[PDB]
């Protein structure tokens, strides 16, 4: 699978290892949600990551579902 | 505002804030001293001290800071940093610390 | 360490016979010493409410231990001055504490 990840600077399209066949996208408002917007974590996960009252998780099994909201999959 | 800059440049050409305004040698400046209490914080009796948050309300007349508002787009009042005008050294004499002067300028 | 001493003394009052009017003296003075030690604990220990520390659990334990010792001490003292004129010994009292237990008490003498 190929996902977008914020584990690289800049954001890059990478090939997840074995077991991680899902592309995810966490987004939550931190102290700077007003100026900068929501945080954006991207990457690959084996099991879909857990969600919290403030987090907003998008979860796929397809290639490049998880672009930064200012980009297209 | 361009009229405010012009007016400030005019007023403060030869204005010295080290000098007490006496349009005529021998005059006295009239200072009105009021006090606004915002909170009586503490009256520690072990050290005989009294802590307050107050606004002083000072008023005086500086003959040098005059102008016709008709010449400056109707500017009838200016807000000017305190360090730029002459101000009297109105202080708390009966302090227990060594802080005579005010905190917020 | 002071808490250890106080807990040991708490357990210790139970070898003191009621004939000496000092069981309550001892237990209650252990309790007073532990209250003064709570007083110093409040000065040497964090005053936070996020969790009970280990010392706090131990302190509460020794305090409940002392207090239970005092309560059972009172019960013992009353069982001592339990006159026949007003109370009659039942069957279980002279069956357990007089015919069974004294026979399985080897450290007693």
């Amino acid at each position: 699978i190929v996902c977008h990840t914020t584990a690289t600077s800049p954001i890059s399209a990478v090939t997840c290892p074995p077991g991680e066949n899902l592309c995810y996208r966490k987004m939550w408002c931190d102290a700077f949600c007003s100026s900068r917007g929501k945080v954006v974590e991207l990457g690959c996960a084996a099991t879909c990551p857990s969600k919290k009252p403030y987090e907003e998780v998008t979860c796929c099994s397809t290639d490049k579902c998880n672009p930064h909201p200012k980009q297209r999959p | 505002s361009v009229m405010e800059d012009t007016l400030l440049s005019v007023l403060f050409e030869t204005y010295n804030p080290k000098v007490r305004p006496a349009q005529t040698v021998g005059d006295k400046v009239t200072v009105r001293v009021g006090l606004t209490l915002t909170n009586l914080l503490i009256l520690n009796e072990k050290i005989e001290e009294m802590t307050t948050n107050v606004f002083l309300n000072l008023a005086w007349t500086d003959y040098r800071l005059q102008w016709d508002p008709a010449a400056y787009e109707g500017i009838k009042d200016l807000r000017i940093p305190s360090s730029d005008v002459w101000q009297p050294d109105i202080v708390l004499m009966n302090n227990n610390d060594g802080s005579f002067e005010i905190t917020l300028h | 360490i002071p808490c250890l001493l106080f807990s040991f003394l708490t357990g210790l009052v139970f070898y003191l016979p009621t004939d000496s009017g000092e069981k309550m003296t001892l237990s209650i003075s252990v309790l007073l010493s532990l209250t003064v030690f709570l007083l110093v604990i409040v000065e040497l220990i964090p005053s936070t409410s996020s969790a009970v520390p280990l010392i706090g659990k131990y302190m509460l334990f020794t305090m409940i231990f002392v207090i239970s010792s005092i309560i059972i001490t009172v019960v013992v003292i009353n069982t001592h001055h339990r006159s026949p004129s007003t109370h009659t010994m039942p069957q279980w009292v002279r069956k357990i504490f007089i015919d069974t237990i004294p026979n399985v008490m080897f450290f007693s003498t």
């Binding site: 931190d30 102290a31 919290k52 403030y54 | 807000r79 | 309550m24 209650i28 996020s50």
Partner: protein, 100 residues
Amino acid sequence: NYDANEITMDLMTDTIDGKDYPIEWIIIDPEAFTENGEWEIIHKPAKKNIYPDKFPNGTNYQDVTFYLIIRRKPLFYVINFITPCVLISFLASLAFYLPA
């Protein structure tokens, strides 16, 4: 330093769904906030306050106030003040079972 006719203190606005909304609360990062060990935050409002008894010329007609309604965590006292005293007073009561 300025009167209400010279500057206007307002609350910051934000957007979610193409609509502007004011930030009527203190902002607190939900991950990077380490809760204090004695106080819990229940409410955290923010208000722009106008005092119409006063005049706009003047620095007392304006106020942006941020309120913290915080609740105490009652554990240090419950473990070190209330429980011991309660049980010791119970001892006093039980003193009536002690023969003279």
